[PDB]
């Protein structure tokens, strides 16, 4: 069962166990992908939200691991709202949203930024293709109207920035206490 008690501990245990594992096609294992993420924006000064919402961001590729939340068979293909339905019953609902959305804002961006589709790695790249390409004009005001635009947008860059060969990062415990914080903003 779990709760605002016990969360943290269990996203740390995926982390310990899982996070070793390979980031498809990408210089990074999953902890260094999310660890990077997370620790880029800590040492750029950006907010714990934006922080947390990197750090957790593709904790939705373990769907072995949310039997508990009885999720259908189309919440399960998409990491990213796999993801957010595990994080929804514990989180701020910015943080959710940086995790649901972090696909569509690089379908967004494919859209609006004309130089931005040439300078991602062709593991974005090919998963653009099977993601359903950049936004129409309707999808774009569309994910426009999302009051947490701003923060979706920042944590899509730290998951593009987050695949570098090298980077000293802390571990998931370091940015634990903070994930209890952004718990404990929600459930009071
Ligand atoms: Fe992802
Ligand atoms: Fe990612």
């Known amino acids: 069962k779990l709760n605002r008690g016990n969360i943290v501990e269990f996203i740390g245990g995926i982390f310990d166990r899982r996070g070793d594992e390979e980031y498809l096609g990408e210089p990074v294992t999953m902890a260094e992908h999310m660890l990077q993420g997370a620790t880029i924006?800590?040492?750029?000064?950006?907010?714990?939200?934006?922080?947390?919402?990197?750090?957790?961001?593709?904790?939705g590729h373990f769907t072995s691991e949310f039997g508990m939340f009885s999720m259908d068979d189309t919440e399960?293909?998409?990491?990213?709202?796999?993801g957010a339905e595990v994080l929804e019953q514990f989180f701020p609902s910015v943080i959710t949203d940086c995790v649901r959305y972090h696909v569509a804002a690089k379908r967004y961006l494919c859209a609006t930024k004309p130089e931005y589709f040439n300078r991602l790695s062709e593991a974005s790249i090919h998963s653009l293709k099977?993601?359903?390409?950049?936004?129409?004009?309707?999808?774009?005001?569309?994910?426009?109207?999302?009051?947490?635009?701003?923060?979706i947008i920042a944590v899509r860059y730290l998951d593009e920035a987050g695949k570098r060969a090298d980077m000293e990062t802390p571990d998931y415990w370091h940015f634990a206490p903070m994930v209890q914080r952004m718990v404990d903003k929600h459930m009071g």
């Open 76 to 82: 399960d293909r998409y990491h990213e709202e796999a």
């Open 41 to 59: 924006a800590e040492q750029n000064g950006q907010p714990e939200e934006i922080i947390v919402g990197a750090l957790l961001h593709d904790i």
């Open 130 to 151: 099977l993601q359903g390409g950049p936004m129409d004009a309707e999808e774009v005001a569309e994910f426009e109207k999302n009051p947490n635009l701003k923060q």
